[PDB]
RNA sequence: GUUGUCCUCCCGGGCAUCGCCGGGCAGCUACGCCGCAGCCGAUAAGGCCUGAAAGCAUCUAAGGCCGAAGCGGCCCCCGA
């Protein structure tokens, strides 16, 4: 339990990002689009003190601090989302089969995965754009949360655990999020 | 059709408690035929995102995406 009487943390907001508050509900608009969330937790008020956004509750308890810093981090993902957006780059890697990745409409379709005759599909969200260039594909969009979800829906579609996991590695995987994951 | 017998014979009948045997309509039956799904919602086990506590990491701590023949719906039966 960290103990302060304010307890108060402060979010630095650029000139590029304007934040508007209406209770516990946050909208963040910059030079490109807008994004809304509801921050829900008891007793945590978000309001704007000048150029600065403040997230506060009177009482310090351990639960609260965690939730408070997550909200700070959601703001921060909006500040670099609404400015210029988020890019995660992904690779489709195949063990045996030229594996055809195309966007047909508001779903991405992956065909010819493991010699399958059937289509695989995975959902794309209304703020996210999927571009395929060769067997690199880059998922691109206004929001990190959203971008992160779309990418992982693609991966969860190709999922394989019904055979050995060392000698079938067919699928599209996360080469990049925003750093490079990972070394074993 | 036929064995026994009674009606004198002929024909046409009775009983032998379907007389025995052969065939069979209607009906009822099978050993016969006809018909008996998919899909959506919300979840579990599980897989993940963001994402802190614990400046990182992390599928959960809050929020979010999927995901059982099971659950609800769909269907079928009854039902002022």
From Swiss-Prot:
Belongs to the universal ribosomal protein uL6 family. Part of the 50S ribosomal subunit. The keyword Transmembrane does not apply. Pfam families: Ribosomal_L6 (PF00347). This is Large ribosomal subunit protein uL6. GO terms for molecular function: rRNA binding; structural constituent of ribosome. InterPro entries: Ribosomal_uL6-like, Ribosomal_uL6-like_a/b-dom_sf, Ribosomal_uL6_a/b-dom, Ribosomal_uL6_arc, Ribosomal_uL6_CS2. Keywords: Ribonucleoprotein, Ribosomal protein, RNA-binding, rRNA-binding. NCBIfam families: PRK05518.1, uL6_arch. GO terms for biological process: cytoplasmic translation. One of its GO terms (cellular component) is cytosolic large ribosomal subunit. It comes from Pyrococcus furiosus (strain ATCC 43587 / DSM 3638 / JCM 8422 / Vc1). HAMAP family: Ribosomal_uL6_A. This protein binds to the 23S rRNA, and is important in its secondary structure. It is located near the subunit interface in the base of the L7/L12 stalk, and near the tRNA binding site of the peptidyltransferase center. The gene is rpl6.
């Amino acid at each position: 339990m960290p103990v302060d009487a304010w307890i108060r943390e402060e979010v630095e907001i650029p000139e590029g990002v304007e934040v508007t508050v209406e209770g516990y509900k946050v909208k963040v608009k910059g030079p490109k689009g807008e994004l809304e969330r509801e921050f829900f937790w008891p007793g945590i008020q978000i309001f704007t003190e000048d150029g600065n956004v403040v997230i506060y509750k009177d009482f310090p308890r351990r639960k609260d601090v965690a939730i408070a810093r997550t909200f700070a981090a959601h703001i921060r993902n909006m500040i670099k989302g609404v400015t210029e957006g988020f890019t995660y780059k992904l690779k489709v890697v195949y063990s045996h089969f030229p594996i055809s990745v195309k966007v047909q409409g508001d779903e991405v379709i992956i065909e010819n995965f493991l010699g399958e005759k059937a289509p695989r599909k995975a959902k794309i969200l209304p703020g996210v754009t999927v571009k395929v260039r060769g067997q690199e594909i880059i998922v691109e969009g206004i929001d990190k949360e959203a971008v992160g979800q779309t990418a992982a829906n693609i991966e969860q579609a190709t999922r394989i655990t019904k055979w050995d996991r060392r000698i079938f590695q067919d699928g599209i995987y996360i080469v990049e999020k925003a750093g490079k994951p990972i070394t074993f």
